[PDB]
Amino acid sequence: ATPHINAQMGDFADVVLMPGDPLRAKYIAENFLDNAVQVCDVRNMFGYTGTYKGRRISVMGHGMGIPSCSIYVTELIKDYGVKKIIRVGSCGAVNEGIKVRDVVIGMGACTDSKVNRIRFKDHDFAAIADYKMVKAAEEAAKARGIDVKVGNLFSAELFYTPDPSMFDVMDKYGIVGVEMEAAGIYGVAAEYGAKALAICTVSDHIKTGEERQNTFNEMIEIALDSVLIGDQ
Amino acid sequence: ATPHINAQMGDFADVVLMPGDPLRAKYIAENFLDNAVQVCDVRNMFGYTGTYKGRRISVMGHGMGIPSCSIYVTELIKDYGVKKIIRVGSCGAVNEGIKVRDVVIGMGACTDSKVNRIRFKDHDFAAIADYKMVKAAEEAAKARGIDVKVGNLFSAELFYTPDPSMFDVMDKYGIVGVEMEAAGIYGVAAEYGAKALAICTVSDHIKTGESEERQNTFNEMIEIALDSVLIGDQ
Amino acid sequence: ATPHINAQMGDFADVVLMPGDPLRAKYIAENFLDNAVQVCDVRNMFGYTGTYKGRRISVMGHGMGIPSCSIYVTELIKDYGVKKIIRVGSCGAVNEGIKVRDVVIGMGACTDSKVNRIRFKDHDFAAIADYKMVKAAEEAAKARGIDVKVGNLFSAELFYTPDPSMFDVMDKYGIVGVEMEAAGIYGVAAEYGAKALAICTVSDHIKTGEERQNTFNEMIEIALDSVLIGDQ
Amino acid sequence: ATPHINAQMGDFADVVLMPGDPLRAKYIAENFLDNAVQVCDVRNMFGYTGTYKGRRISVMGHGMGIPSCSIYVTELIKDYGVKKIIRVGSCGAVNEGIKVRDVVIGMGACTDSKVNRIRFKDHDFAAIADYKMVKAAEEAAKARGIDVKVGNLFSAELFYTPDPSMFDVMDKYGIVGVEMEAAGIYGVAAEYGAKALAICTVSDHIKTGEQTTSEERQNTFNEMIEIALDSVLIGDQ
Amino acid sequence: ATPHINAQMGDFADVVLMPGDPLRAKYIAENFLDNAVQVCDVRNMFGYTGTYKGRRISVMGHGMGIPSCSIYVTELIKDYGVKKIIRVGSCGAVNEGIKVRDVVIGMGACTDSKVNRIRFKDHDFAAIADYKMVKAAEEAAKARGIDVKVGNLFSAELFYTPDPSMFDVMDKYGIVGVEMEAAGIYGVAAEYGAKALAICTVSDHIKTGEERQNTFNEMIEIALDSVLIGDQ
Amino acid sequence: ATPHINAQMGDFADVVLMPGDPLRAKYIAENFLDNAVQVCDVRNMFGYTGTYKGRRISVMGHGMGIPSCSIYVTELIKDYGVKKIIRVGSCGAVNEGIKVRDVVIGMGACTDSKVNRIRFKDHDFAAIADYKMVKAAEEAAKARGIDVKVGNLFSAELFYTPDPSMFDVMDKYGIVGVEMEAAGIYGVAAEYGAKALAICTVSDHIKTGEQTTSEERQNTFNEMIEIALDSVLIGDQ
Numbered sequence A, C, E: 001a002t003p004h005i006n007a008q009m010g011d012f013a014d015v016v017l018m019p020g021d022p023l024r025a026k027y028i029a030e031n032f033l034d035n036a037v038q039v040c041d042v043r044n045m046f047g048y049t050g051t052y053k054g055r056r057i058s059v060m061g062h063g064m065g066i067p068s069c070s071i072y073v074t075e076l077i078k079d080y081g082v083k084k085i086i087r088v089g090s091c092g093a094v095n096e097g098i099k100v101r102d103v104v105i106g107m108g109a110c111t112d113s114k115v116n117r118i119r120f121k122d123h124d125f126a127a128i129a130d131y132k133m134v135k136a137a138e139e140a141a142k143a144r145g146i147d148v149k150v151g152n153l154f155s156a157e158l159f160y161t162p163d164p165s166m167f168d169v170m171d172k173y174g175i176v177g178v179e180m181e182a183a184g185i186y187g188v189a190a191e192y193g194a195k196a197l198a199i200c201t202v203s204d205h206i207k208t209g210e211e212r213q214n215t216f217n218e219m220i221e222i223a224l225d226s227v228l229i230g231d232q
Numbered sequence B: 001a002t003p004h005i006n007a008q009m010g011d012f013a014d015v016v017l018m019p020g021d022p023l024r025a026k027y028i029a030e031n032f033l034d035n036a037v038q039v040c041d042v043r044n045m046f047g048y049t050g051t052y053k054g055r056r057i058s059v060m061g062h063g064m065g066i067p068s069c070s071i072y073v074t075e076l077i078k079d080y081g082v083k084k085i086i087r088v089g090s091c092g093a094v095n096e097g098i099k100v101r102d103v104v105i106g107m108g109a110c111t112d113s114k115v116n117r118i119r120f121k122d123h124d125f126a127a128i129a130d131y132k133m134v135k136a137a138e139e140a141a142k143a144r145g146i147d148v149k150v151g152n153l154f155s156a157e158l159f160y161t162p163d164p165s166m167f168d169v170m171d172k173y174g175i176v177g178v179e180m181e182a183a184g185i186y187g188v189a190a191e192y193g194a195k196a197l198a199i200c201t202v203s204d205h206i207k208t209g210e211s212e213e214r215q216n217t218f219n220e221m222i223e224i225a226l227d228s229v230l231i232g233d234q
Numbered sequence D, F: 001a002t003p004h005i006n007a008q009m010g011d012f013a014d015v016v017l018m019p020g021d022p023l024r025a026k027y028i029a030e031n032f033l034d035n036a037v038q039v040c041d042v043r044n045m046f047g048y049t050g051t052y053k054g055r056r057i058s059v060m061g062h063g064m065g066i067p068s069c070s071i072y073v074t075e076l077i078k079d080y081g082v083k084k085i086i087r088v089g090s091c092g093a094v095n096e097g098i099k100v101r102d103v104v105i106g107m108g109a110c111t112d113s114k115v116n117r118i119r120f121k122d123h124d125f126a127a128i129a130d131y132k133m134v135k136a137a138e139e140a141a142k143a144r145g146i147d148v149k150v151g152n153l154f155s156a157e158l159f160y161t162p163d164p165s166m167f168d169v170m171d172k173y174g175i176v177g178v179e180m181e182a183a184g185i186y187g188v189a190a191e192y193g194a195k196a197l198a199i200c201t202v203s204d205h206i207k208t209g210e211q212t213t214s215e216e217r218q219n220t221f222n223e224m225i226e227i228a229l230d231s232v233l234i235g236d237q
Helices: A020-029 A066-080 A115-119 A131-143 A166-174 A184-191 A212-231 B021-031 B064-078 B116-118 B131-143 B166-172 B182-191 B212-233 C021-031 C067-082 C116-119 C131-143 C164-174 C182-191 C212-231 D023-032 D066-080 D115-119 D131-143 D166-172 D182-192 D213-236 E022-032 E066-080 E115-119 E129-143 E166-172 E182-192 E210-229 F022-031 F068-081 F114-118 F131-143 F166-172 F182-191 F214-236
Strands: A015-018 A034-040 A047-052 A057-062 A084-093 A103-111 A148-155 A177-179 A194-207 B015-018 B036-038 B046-051 B054-060 B084-093 B103-111 B148-155 B177-181 B194-207 C015-018 C035-042 C045-053 C055-062 C086-093 C103-111 C148-155 C178-180 C195-205 D013-018 D034-040 D047-052 D055-060 D084-092 D103-111 D146-156 D175-179 D196-203 E015-018 E034-040 E046-051 E055-060 E084-094 E103-111 E148-153 E177-180 E195-205 F015-018 F033-042 F047-052 F055-060 F084-093 F102-112 F150-155 F177-179 F195-205
Touching: A015 A020, A015 A066, A015 A212, A020 A034, A020 A047, A020 A057, A034 E210, A047 C116, A047 D213, A057 A212, A066 A084, A066 A115, A066 B064, A084 A131, A084 A184, A084 A212, A103 A131, A103 A177, A103 A184, A103 A212, A115 A184, A131 A148, A131 A194, A131 A212, A131 D131, A131 D146, A131 D166, A131 E210, A148 A184, A148 D131, A177 A194, A177 F055, A184 A194, A184 B212, B015 B021, B015 B064, B015 B212, B021 B036, B021 B046, B021 B054, B021 B212, B046 B212, B046 F182, B054 B212, B064 B116, B064 B182, B064 B194, B084 B131, B084 B182, B084 B212, B103 B131, B103 B182, B103 B212, B116 B182, B116 F177, B131 B148, B131 B194, B148 B182, B148 B194, B148 C131, B148 F047, B166 D066, B177 C055, B177 F195, B182 B194, B194 B212, B194 F166, C015 C021, C015 C067, C015 C212, C015 D182, C021 C035, C021 C045, C021 C055, C021 C212, C035 C055, C035 C067, C045 C212, C045 F177, C055 C212, C067 C086, C067 C116, C067 E066, C086 C131, C086 C182, C086 C212, C103 C131, C103 C212, C131 C148, C131 C212, C131 D047, C148 D175, C148 E182, C178 C195, C182 C195, C195 C212, D013 D023, D013 D066, D023 D034, D023 D047, D023 D055, D034 D055, D047 D175, D047 D213, D055 D213, D066 D084, D066 D115, D066 E177, D066 F068, D084 D131, D084 D213, D103 D131, D103 D175, D103 D182, D103 D213, D103 F022, D103 F195, D115 F195, D131 D196, D131 D213, D131 F150, D146 D182, D166 D175, D175 D196, D175 E084, D182 D196, D196 D213, E015 E022, E015 E066, E015 E210, E022 E034, E022 E046, E022 E055, E022 E210, E034 E055, E046 E210, E046 F177, E055 E210, E066 E084, E066 E182, E066 F047, E084 E129, E084 E182, E103 E129, E103 E177, E103 E182, E103 E210, E103 F102, E115 E166, E115 E182, E129 E195, E129 E210, E129 F131, E129 F150, E148 E182, E148 F131, E166 E210, E177 E195, E195 E210, F015 F022, F015 F214, F022 F033, F022 F047, F022 F055, F047 F131, F047 F214, F068 F084, F068 F114, F068 F182, F084 F131, F084 F182, F084 F214, F102 F131, F102 F182, F102 F214, F114 F182, F131 F150, F131 F214, F177 F195, F182 F195
Parallel strands: A015 A057, A015 A084, A084 A194, A103 A148, A148 A177, B015 B054, B015 B084, B084 B194, B103 B148, B148 B177, C015 C055, C015 C086, C086 C195, C103 C148, C148 C178, D013 D055, D013 D084, D084 D196, D103 D146, D146 D175, E015 E055, E015 E084, E084 E195, E103 E148, E148 E177, F015 F055, F015 F084, F084 F195, F102 F150, F150 F177
Antiparallel strands: A034 A047, A047 A057, A084 A177, A103 A194, B036 B046, B046 B054, B084 B177, B103 B194, C035 C045, C045 C055, C086 C178, C103 C195, D034 D047, D047 D055, D084 D175, D103 D196, E034 E046, E046 E055, E084 E177, E103 E195, F033 F047, F047 F055, F084 F177, F102 F195
């Protein structure tokens, strides 16, 4: 029993899929997993454990932003023995070579947050995903014939940014998508010795101002298939 | 009809009480407000509008941390006409003069976050509450025989901090309670020209290590906040 | 008998009013206090102790800027037993809603200085006044028919700023007045466990370019009446 | 005809292998490339162009440290059309999970330098390698029976650090090796739109005092270069 | 007529000697200069203009700390045509090879202040004195057989530092003296195209805890002699 | 017998002249020193020891950029007993008061690097030269009729800067020339208790687009080296 998660050790699988919205975790448990049972509900942050093709897998919301996400993944790892975390969600694109509904994988995560600087003595910590998980997801996508873009995500602290000119810097530096928690997750996995990966689907084009459900399903199938591939 | 709040203009009152826990918002709606009706539920972030002594008041969770808190209160202010936000929650204490169950009001909020530096050209922005709201809350508590400590909160980005020696620094500088969203709310209030206040109840003593008594003290904090709304209206 | 103050313990009252200009301290001692006697003059920084309606009160200049102000109020607090400091001065306004001759109370104080970051491990320390002092001052003004603005001051390190565009940012965030020492006084009050308040009169409008003695006298009376309201 | 490189357009291939030491570049061009010709020598910074299994490949020294390697990689990309860069060097280990003689690939590069903060408005830029190059290098090592550690390198500005306690921080965060130029190469590659990769061989263990002989190190160095050149062919597809 | 200096263009010479204490400026005008006449007195910051060996020279206090000193030197330079500033004062020593009463010249000035970072886009500005002024002062000292140490001063923002371990860092990097304004003066001189120099006398040994009036006179004679040397 | 320098204690004099390019070290040792013998060549970074008017003097390249520079000066000081270092190079001018072919001395060195912040608890370290070396070089140039500009150099981390508006800032604050290693040499010299000086010749004007022939550049460079060597003898007295 932890402060933010009302479950017991053993309730979660060693791998957890994590959308930000708890209703998306409920949607995933009911439509993609077999026999999912709810294992937590504190603060309405629903978490479930079921199986995918016989493999035990959990799915749980993490809320919005770095701080919220860090609390949950930190507790999953140190209190529930979770080894691998796959964040799943929507992101905004800033570059011309990425179109809405494209599937991006964050090999790395840039950020404007100070959390990695507080852990790394104020130097530049490169928040990165676990290589084998990236590979697994790219192979799972290829198997279904889905193209994915692997690159840097940008984890913003402020959804309603006071500095919009930063989207032009992101673009020039190849940022593939903007979300709000990947840099925090990667930071937590490094601090606690676990492995993470963030997968996103472009829901909006910040620059050009540019189905959704179906593309969401492809993202989920890719993440879940990457879990089985990762076990081999 | 915003991305994070599925309500209509007019659904929220001009004043909103905001616990971090959506289930706390539900508890407040059911036990302290009259005829409260749910006005939003995207992402399970429950929001309700009811009445306190004839005065229309809203209550809604804001989730955990500065980024989450900023999204909700920003949308509330710019799309729902919200004028006053009172965050209500639990905090940890670092100072010996403050005990568990004490009620603290955050006249200012320190932080280890970068959000106010992004807004203020990397200079020191003093994230403060609206004075009249502090004053109303302090008078409301005084009328209920409750002693409140008014000072600086500290809004942490990392609940599981990699640097626990910071708690000794906070204590040395008078921090009255440690939580996670006050500096963000005050920063948003200053950016969008609204008014905000953070009231908290000490649920844990981070230094000394110190449900019923907490529930009771939680009810005390809610009553103060709601009574400050009426004193604030005069 | 300190390095910057040549007085003895007991020479100052427990409450000190501090204009930046030592000649302003002399003015206040002579026209608002009864039987004030000079208690210090090292570096020409005049300090006086007198009585306001029977209540012992001190007034002393603190010079210009954060470093100068910190030295004096630190010595007053640790060597002279000073419990409450009320800084009084003139300030520039950046906001359109604030006019010259308006009285502002600094509940908080922003700064481009590094002093609070040196004290607070490089994180954001919110330099704020003592709530009760703010409340007393606001009550005092209300009793004299004076409308005061309570909010954020900005304490600048450079009077001749190399970056005048900061004035638009301050305005955007509600800064009520720009001066040079409130963030340092509040930081010292927090470090040594004392109480402080900054009250100012808008002498110039930095944005619009926009009696002064009269409004200055108004600010002095509010400060002195706040001390008596604060004693109850 | 740039200031630091005295070659002409077309002298370099579109993929360039880069050790820090110009003599290692000479050694690679001589022993691993066919028909290598020296194409530049400004400041004794030797650059050659040869062929590997019929494919055109260049090898060039980049000096030590971020500032020196940025100058050369920037010139190769903007003046000579280079699209892919593979840095091949030596790094020190800080983690007990990594052993001397290990082959590490920098998927990312942490640093104590300010070069990426100057480029990215003082926010945190995750200095990363090109994913497909990491994958080609990882497959190539696997195909040669070499097990590679894929993770975060740390590019130090001061070889003789004034703060050794940072090594304990690097170990806790899983840094796989400490070197001096990856974070700078990754920043340049992102700024100019090219692709980069840093591969390293562990010559010393900072934390455990472990050393290796010059024989063993030559051999492990030899493995690294074969992986890199193989990865080029895999990457071409 | 400037806000902080009540004088007219022409009242100051092109070179100004500046102790922090205005009473020290008064002592210098009366004892070292011929026919010195007071030219300013706003805020009790006395300024005087007299003659040294027939050479017109001014002496004025600048108060304590960077912010205060910056206002005065900025106004002297841009409003009163001052070309050279020599700050004179007492400093604390942190290094074992520097004893009390030694005369140190700040060829450079380190600091914990943010003022040069605000001017220099957050990079490292090396606040340095004007080389010809350093040279003139070192030669003036040699003529009178006084030994001087030329090196880095450290300009502290906080007289009562919350971080005393910084004195050991200063010592290790060769800081010759700790004072509070040299880095600010050097910054202003650079920004406004003027020349500055800080000369100090060690009044206390911060480390070892270790006449004064006479060593003060040596410092002043050296500065004034450097002015004549500098004119050749 | 250090990692980057293949010499033995006593091979270097107590004073070392240091250009960035090792071929310039060769040129100086051959043309200005008597009986110069090469004493190291690790990574093609040539170091020599010769005599000037009977006074033992060494000359050695330091590569480009702070990090490379720091490694060599740090090794000369801690492993080989060097007491004084004079960096002799080329710089770009940003101020209209400085013309191409001018000789500038860096009494101080500004920088956009983080190496002195890492050493000085994140506060502002004024990276400064040794006063008596500045004075010896200034008198030596005066004695030769050369008028030197004494001031602040700016040591850039990125030669190909992503922020060129910074040059207008350096101009406003009087920077005398832009190079890449002075702030790092001064930091090392202060960390290890040694003395250093950076002298530079203006080969190009960044702000006005002024250039100079290779002939003019050789001659101005020739003047700089004689100033430096003369400053060593004056410094000994």
